[PDB]
Amino acid sequence: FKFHSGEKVLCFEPDPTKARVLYDAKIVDVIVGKDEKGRKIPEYLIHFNGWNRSWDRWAAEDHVLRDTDENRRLQRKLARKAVA
Protein backbone atom coordinates (compact mmCIF):
# COMPACT_ATOMS: atom_id res chain seq x y z
CA PHE A 1 0.00 0.00 0.00
CA LYS A 2 0.99 3.62 0.55
CA PHE A 3 3.98 2.82 2.73
CA HIS A 4 6.35 -0.08 2.69
CA SER A 5 8.41 -2.01 5.22
CA GLY A 6 11.72 -0.39 5.80
CA GLU A 7 10.33 3.01 4.98
CA LYS A 8 11.21 5.91 7.12
CA VAL A 9 8.20 7.94 8.08
CA LEU A 10 6.61 10.37 10.46
CA CYS A 11 3.98 8.98 12.73
CA PHE A 12 1.43 10.51 15.10
CA GLU A 13 1.58 9.93 18.79
CA PRO A 14 -0.31 6.72 19.06
CA ASP A 15 -1.61 7.61 22.56
CA PRO A 16 -4.79 9.78 22.40
CA THR A 17 -4.34 11.19 25.89
CA LYS A 18 -0.97 12.72 24.95
CA ALA A 19 0.10 15.81 23.08
CA ARG A 20 -0.51 15.41 19.36
CA VAL A 21 3.00 15.33 17.96
CA LEU A 22 4.81 13.70 15.09
CA TYR A 23 7.61 11.22 15.72
CA ASP A 24 10.35 10.10 13.39
CA ALA A 25 9.59 6.50 12.74
CA LYS A 26 10.06 3.46 10.63
CA ILE A 27 7.73 0.89 9.13
CA VAL A 28 8.64 -2.45 10.70
CA ASP A 29 5.76 -4.45 9.33
CA VAL A 30 2.70 -4.10 7.19
CA ILE A 31 -0.33 -6.26 7.48
CA VAL A 32 -3.56 -6.53 5.61
CA GLY A 33 -6.29 -6.21 8.18
CA LYS A 34 -10.02 -5.75 8.22
CA ASP A 35 -12.41 -2.92 8.95
CA GLU A 36 -15.56 -3.18 11.00
CA LYS A 37 -17.34 -3.92 7.74
CA GLY A 38 -14.83 -6.40 6.54
CA ARG A 39 -13.04 -4.26 3.96
CA LYS A 40 -9.34 -4.81 3.54
CA ILE A 41 -7.41 -2.05 5.22
CA PRO A 42 -3.66 -1.91 5.80
CA GLU A 43 -2.11 -1.90 9.21
CA TYR A 44 1.39 -0.69 9.92
CA LEU A 45 3.63 -1.63 12.79
CA ILE A 46 5.68 1.34 13.64
CA HIS A 47 8.97 1.76 15.27
CA PHE A 48 9.74 5.11 16.89
CA ASN A 49 13.25 6.14 16.20
CA GLY A 50 15.30 6.50 19.34
CA TRP A 51 13.00 4.36 21.42
CA ASN A 52 13.40 0.57 21.73
CA ARG A 53 11.32 -2.02 20.16
CA SER A 54 9.07 -2.35 23.22
CA TRP A 55 7.58 0.97 22.19
CA ASP A 56 6.45 -0.35 18.80
CA ARG A 57 2.77 0.36 18.07
CA TRP A 58 0.19 -0.70 15.50
CA ALA A 59 -1.23 2.23 13.66
CA ALA A 60 -3.80 2.92 10.96
CA GLU A 61 -2.74 4.54 7.63
CA ASP A 62 -4.33 7.72 8.91
CA HIS A 63 -1.59 7.98 11.48
CA VAL A 64 1.38 7.70 9.26
CA LEU A 65 2.79 10.50 7.19
CA ARG A 66 5.31 10.50 4.44
CA ASP A 67 8.69 11.99 5.44
CA THR A 68 8.24 15.07 3.41
CA ASP A 69 9.22 18.81 3.63
CA GLU A 70 5.58 19.68 4.32
CA ASN A 71 5.13 17.02 6.99
CA ARG A 72 8.36 18.10 8.61
CA ARG A 73 7.05 21.60 8.74
CA LEU A 74 3.94 20.17 10.40
CA GLN A 75 6.20 18.27 12.84
CA ARG A 76 7.96 21.45 13.92
CA LYS A 77 4.68 23.27 14.24
CA LEU A 78 3.15 20.63 16.52
CA ALA A 79 6.41 20.39 18.47
CA ARG A 80 6.21 24.10 19.34
CA LYS A 81 2.62 23.84 20.41
CA ALA A 82 3.41 20.97 22.70
CA VAL A 83 6.32 22.74 24.42
CA ALA A 84 4.63 26.09 24.84
Binding site: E13, D15, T17, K18, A19, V21, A82
Partner: peptide
Protein backbone atom coordinates in the same frame (compact mmCIF):
# COMPACT_ATOMS: atom_id res chain seq x y z
CA UNK B 1 -0.25 6.53 31.00
CA UNK B 2 2.12 6.94 28.06
CA UNK B 3 5.22 8.88 27.22
CA UNK B 4 5.51 12.63 26.81
CA UNK B 5 3.14 15.56 27.01
Amino acid sequence: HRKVL
